């Protein structure tokens, strides 16, 4: 495993990624894997949802996007805060992935005409203001701070801070694997989108829910699932989880 | 009727004979003569 | 006649069928079709996955014929010789076109040949020799043999070699002769008859866990059921429900 | 058109694609999509099949593929003459309802026999480079994968032709994959049943045909034919060259 | 799963299909599924393969990234043909997909050192010349022509190429669905960790020599000794870590 | 043809059915909330 040890050490010389990742390069139990971090001086929901934000590191404007469900990053140093350039970058996000809804604030950096045209052409919905759960915004701001610490480290390696911003984007996409089972943002992204296509396909049995309180039976309800203790059904826009011994079964 | 269909059409482009005339002259089932009349744009001149 | 009727007559001269096509597809009145068939000298007027196979001779040439019980969709090809090896090759060629599951023969020496058994194995085709155990196909196989012989009796004027005339007859009997229940050509009916996939579509569907608070936690769920206004997904050791607005579904 | 079809047309104006979306996602009948691409100045462009050849181990192998599902029909051909390709194309035409075929301009397809085969069976053929040779690249990649398959199966078959057939079947049924791990057979069957239902849907769509001849208003002359739009008791609505008119049923004739 | 194991092994005796397929017959995690290919004599043998190229249009330079395995095309307008911009674009590529090896046209702007530097610190390999598979060789130019044709219609709705290029890219990524069954390029576009976790254990069974451990189920312990796979009950063997 | 008694039955039932809090409208477009709306 000396080759694996050398490879993991080089990886930390380049990436300083999570020790959970480096356990893979070591191909060794965690006890040694902690040593690379210990010795390291700088160390020791719908798939179509995205959010856009901004930060002002070192007097420059950095606009960052995150896929909420997986900790993915898409970022670019923007020359100016004008809505025209944000429109171009939102065009990029929309082209590269099937993005359905975007959560930003009400500011003119997003309510400008160009952004509205971008959403109109690409087919994206946007929210303007405070989301119902600003803890997600707090999480992405914490991610912004972690990217900033990352930058405070990488800037030893990049002559231009913009390039270090990109370097961080990639480090967090792939090298910094963690959470659940130590997975990179790329892995979660890919798993989520494959799940999404299989769920489009998933989206011959109908049920007459037997409302014994009348007593009466409901009409041609659909069977969204036949669990073990209950049988979900949908009735127009309402989804009523019926009792498993009080649901008729019609085979179509 | 294959022979009579071609002749009744030629006579219809001259005369615009109604369907009974074509059926009597060219020995046609009434449905075929009616089809000849029906597909003539110049012979559609009466409402229901 | 009309251009459509002239085209139908030319299609008859091409395909030796009058009533089965223009009376049904071309909406020709029955009187005109009856007159045409009168003038036409060539017009003398179970367990899906179950096929017959048989051997026939004509003008010193051997023809192996594959039939379908459930709709009379007939495949055929001229054989160089009555030997078993050619029969095995033909049955092979059969296997890849439709999910053949069990065939019945006439216990002939060329069919009891070992190589036939070998092909039936490595393809996965079962042999049920003797006569079929359903009192419809027993005379139906010979009736469709007679039908093919009759079709060739008219096709032969347009092919000097049987090797092409046989395919001509096969196309006629597969599509240009439409009848039976509502006038469905054998090919159509077999489309219908042939029509685990849906289970395997959703086997690896994981879900980004959220809840009614609309969070960005995106826990490592497994999709259990979809529909009726919400989802049913397991959360580690427990079970909950989430509306469709959240709980993004991805492949594992 | 329907709100979905109007939305599809607006999405075309937004995205400059007609057939790839409304024919597949919006379930539009192929005739309407063809009419739209014909009218679309920005669109220069189940019955589609392609035929090709390969020269594995010094022998000629001619392979057909159904584009929409990854199906295979192949046979080791004794020679490259158009006579035998005519026989095999006869086989393809008999076995499935094949409407159009995409090959090259070579004499292996422009020979007289192939033209007779298309004439008898009712098949159209393209001769040359298709507008999207990436499909040809895909089928060539499939040819290479069949060749790797052969490099493996030839441990099992005494005659390479038989291994060619074995591969045909393996890819038809056993090698299920894509979308939800489906065999070529499953996709083929789904597509053709959907095609039957779309013929029925096209019939019911075109129902709502009718030539209407009518006496125009104050005009002694009868005109027509116009397209019928709606039929009440006593009156109809008619389309006479993009000019909607309302005519009492006394002054109209519906054929 | 012994029935599943036998079925997958027979399938390889007949088909030698992808181990990804055989994971289904096994109905088991990938660690065992790799073994059928590993033991297969005709087996035990490129997604992550992208092209890059430079194009010009109306006096503007456009760098285009393609994917061989589905024709999913990325692109962006470049301020200038210099190498540094190319390195920045390739950087931006690295973080979106696990790019592993790219091929170029040996141009001076691509043979520039900074391109090599970026390919290193990201971990991207360069295979210059022309691709060694006779599909992408004409496919790269065919998709270049496709992008040019798409722009030929897009241009009426964008006065600057910098936006029209992204318009064309979104069209070619999703709104053009075709190929096998009509799948848009975007749609078309753990086991090793388990293998690495267990490959440091040695098993002594019945005692016999050391064996490579493969699985540690609930009722058995599958091993591999002398290039042969033997199932033993759990109590009949001892597992130690080396 | 309703005698006064019946009509008054009807009127008083209508009356009881007709017998049968301030809000901050949350303008998320800003996002912002409105004042003491009634």
From Swiss-Prot, chain C:
Subunit annotation: Homotetramer; may further associate as a homohexadecamer. Part of the pre-integration complex (PIC) which is composed of viral genome, matrix protein, Vpr and integrase. Interacts with human SMARCB1/INI1 and human PSIP1/LEDGF isoform 1. Interacts with human KPNA3; this interaction might play a role in nuclear import of the pre-integration complex. Interacts with human NUP153; this interaction might play a role in nuclear import of the pre-integration complex.
Domain Integrase catalytic residues, every copy: 46-194
Zn finger (Integrase-type) start-end: 3-44
Record remark: domains: The core domain contains the D-x(n)-D-x(35)-E motif, named for the phylogenetically conserved glutamic acid and aspartic acid residues and the invariant 35 amino acid spacing between the second and third acidic residues. Each acidic residue of the D,D(35)E motif is independently essential for the 3'-processing and strand transfer activities of purified integrase protein.
Shown residues in whole-protein numbering: 1148 to 1417 of 1435
Organism: Human immunodeficiency virus type 1 group M subtype B (isolate NY5) (HIV-1)
Annotated region of DNA binding: 205-252
Subcellular location: Virion; Host nucleus; Host cytoplasm
Protein name: Integrase
Binding positions for Zn(2+) per the UniProt entry: 12, 16, 40, 43
Curated annotation (Swiss-Prot), chain E:
Integrase catalytic domain ranges (all copies): 46-189
Regions crossing the membrane: none
SUBUNIT field: Homotetramer; may further associate as a homohexadecamer. Part of the pre-integration complex (PIC) which is composed of viral genome, matrix protein, Vpr and integrase. Interacts with human SMARCB1/INI1 and human PSIP1/LEDGF isoform 1. Interacts with human KPNA3; this interaction might play a role in nuclear import of the pre-integration complex. Interacts with human NUP153; this interaction might play a role in nuclear import of the pre-integration complex.
Residues that coordinate or bind Mg(2+) 3: 53, 105, 141
Subcellular location: Virion; Host nucleus; Host cytoplasm
Binding site for Zn(2+): 12, 16, 40, 43
Protein name: Integrase
Domain remark in the UniProt entry: The core domain contains the D-x(n)-D-x(35)-E motif, named for the phylogenetically conserved glutamic acid and aspartic acid residues and the invariant 35 amino acid spacing between the second and third acidic residues. Each acidic residue of the D,D(35)E motif is independently essential for the 3'-processing and strand transfer activities of purified integrase protein.
């Amino acid at each position: 495993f000396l080759d694996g040890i050398d490879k993991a050490q080089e990886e930390h010389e380049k990436y300083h990624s999570n020790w959970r990742a480096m356990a893979s390069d070591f191909n060794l139990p965690p006890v040694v894997a902690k040593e690379i971090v210990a010795s390291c001086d700088k160390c020791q929901c719908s798939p179509g949802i995205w959010q856009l934000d901004c930060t002002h590191l070192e007097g420059k404007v950095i606009l960052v996007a995150v896929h909420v469900a997986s900790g993915y990053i898409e970022a670019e140093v923007i020359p100016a805060e004008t809505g025209q350039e944000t429109a171009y970058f939102l065009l990029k996000l929309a082209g590269r992935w099937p993005v359905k809804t975007v959560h930003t604030d009400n500011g003119s950096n997003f309510t400008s005409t160009t952004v509205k045209a971008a959403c109109w052409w690409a087919g994206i919905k946007q929210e303007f203001g405070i989301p119902y759960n600003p803890q997600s915004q707090g999480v992405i701001e914490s991610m912004n701070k972690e990217l900033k610490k990352i930058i405070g480290q990488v800037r030893d390696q990049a002559e231009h801070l913009k390039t270090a911003v990109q370097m961080a984007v990639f480090i967090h996409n792939f090298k910094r694997k963690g959470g659940i089972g130590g997975y990179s943002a790329g892995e979660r992204i890919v798993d989520i989108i494959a799940t999404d296509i299989q769920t489009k396909e998933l989206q011959n049995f109908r049920v007459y829910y037997r409302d014994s309180r009348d007593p009466v039976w409901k009409g041609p309800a659909k069977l969204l699932w036949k669990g073990e203790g209950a049988v979900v059904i949908q009735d127009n826009s309402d989804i009523k989880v019926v009792p498993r011994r009080k649901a008729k079964i019609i085979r179509d | 009727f294959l022979d009579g269909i071609d002749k009744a059409q030629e006579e219809h482009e001259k005369y615009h004979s109604n369907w009974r005339a074509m059926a009597s002259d060219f020995n046609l089932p009434p449905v075929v003569a009616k089809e000849i009349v029906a597909s003539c744009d110049k012979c559609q001149l009466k409402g229901e």
